[model samples]
Every structure is written in C-alpha cells, then in structure tokens.
Target: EQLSFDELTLINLSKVVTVNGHEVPMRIKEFELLWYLASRENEVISKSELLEKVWANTVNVHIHRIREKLEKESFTTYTITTVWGLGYKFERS
Candidate 1:
C-alpha cells in the first residue's frame, strides 16, 4: 500500500535523507523540496516535478542550491544523487 503522504514529514533512505527539523532554519522552497524528496524516498523524482511543485511553477535554471544546502548541512554521506539525463534519486543504501 502506498503510504499516505500526510505521514511523510521526513524521509530517511539509509543515507539520502530529507528532514523537517525545527532546530534548523529552512526557507519555504527549501522545506517544500525536502518534503518532496522525503515523500518520495528511494524513488527517482523528476526535475520537472521539482520545478513545477517547488519552484513556483517555473522551469528555468538548474542550479544546485538544494544540493549545496544539503551538503552544507552534512546531510549526505552520498545522499541525493543526479540521474544524468532523467532527474535525481536518493542514493539507495
């Protein structure tokens, strides 16, 4: 059964984790991103989905701010990974 997204406040996929801890400050978009990734852990989330959902319905730049932030937070031990041509997937542990 597909888990209800309402219960998906955080995603922990071995190492590629997305969380919503109040201790750390996150921007609105950043939190939305974390929510998306966490909600779909282990699944490859399309860049289009991220753009449409998290980026105010616009598709333009492909900066790595999210990746950068995660790195800055030391969240990835190899967590989020690029999919070359498709999109991205939380590195399966």
Candidate 2:
C-alpha cells in the first residue's frame, strides 16, 4: 500500500511527506483529508462527495473547516486543486 511521488512514499494510513529529506508532519484530520484526495489522484472529487463519504462521521465541526485547513497547509504540494462550484482534483504525475 505504498504510493510514491518523486522521492516521497505515501501509505494509506500514514501521513509522512518527506521532501528533500525533510519530513512534514500532518495532523490526523489533515492526513485523512489529504489521503482521501491523494487516493483519488488525478480525479475530480466534489466537496459534497468528500463530506458525505470522508467527513460524514463527524458532526461537531463544519466541512468548510477542512478546506480551510487544507488551504493553511500546502495541499497544493499533493497536487490538490479546487474545482470551484463543483469539487477538487489531484494533480496527475
């Protein structure tokens, strides 16, 4: 269950992004959120879809917060792009 990008290794349950030998730590939510997007790499995924599927288990927080967190972090590094009114898409390598 290892996925690689350049020199990085990504496992479904892991959240360690090493760039140029530097490791960037990701929070639980961040990891899960990114993992979901990464798993769908190169595919457009809707916010509602992620909300309904990935964040569906939680009720104490808003889904937009997830997007905000991603923005705060550099989801772009994972090639995460927003599709405006529709959804999001991960970059294809």
Candidate 3:
C-alpha cells in the first residue's frame, strides 16, 4: 500500500519516499519518522504520541533530525511544523 498527499508518495511496501515520482533515499529511521508523520497528516501529533508510538526511546533530537532530512528531501511540497507547546503537524501543500 501507498500513502500520498500532493506530489509526495510514501511507498509503504518498499519503505521508500518519492517526491513527484522521484525516489528519495533515506535512512530507516528517517523513513519511519516520515511514515509516522504522514500517517497522521494535518493532525497535531504530540511529542509524547510520537515517542510512545514511533521512537520507542528518544524524541526531540530525532524529531529535529527527521525534520532536517525531510526538508532537504521533500523540496517545498511537504513540511513538518513545530507546534510550539503541543508538538508537530505534517502539512502538505
């Protein structure tokens, strides 16, 4: 199965990310982070929620790192925004 928003596509079976049909190579952890965020796109997903569900152990540093990677790879089509007090929201536009 695959999940997509705008020009971004999360190829679930291959654990791959594609932007406008171009495959973007990513580390496993990065893929996991993107997958989780995209899974809850448009929702304000808390750090605790991401921690409990996605990262198993750490949160902050990984989230920042994941954001960096996503930003570098996703062009300008998608973004993971910091929600200040709440957490993060994955937006596609």
* TM-scores of all predicted structures: 0.57, 0.63, 0.77
Question: In model 1, which range of ten residues has the least summed lDDT?
Answer: 1-10
By TM-score rank, best first, the candidates go 3, 2, 1
Encode model 3's per-residue lDDT on 1-93: one tens digit a residue: 689877778887789988778887877766777788888889988888887776543667777776676577656677888889898888865
TM-score of 1: 0.57
1-93, model 2: which lDDT tens digit per residue?
A: 556665444566466654444565656665566667767788888777777676543412433454454445544344566677877766643
**Per-model C-alpha lDDT, please?**
0.52, 0.59, 0.77
Task: Give the better candidate number (2 or 3) by lDDT.
Answer: 3
Give the residue spans of candidate 3 off by over 4 A.
none
Which residue segments of model 1 deviate by more than 4 Å?
Answer: 1-22, 56-63
Q: What lDDT does candidate 1 reach at residue 64?
A: 62
For residue 65, model 2's alpha carbon misses the true position, in angstroms, by 9.8
Ten-residue stretch with the least lDDT total in model 2: 56-65
Model 2 TM-score?
0.63
lDDT of 2 at 55: 55
Ranking by lDDT: 3, 2, 1
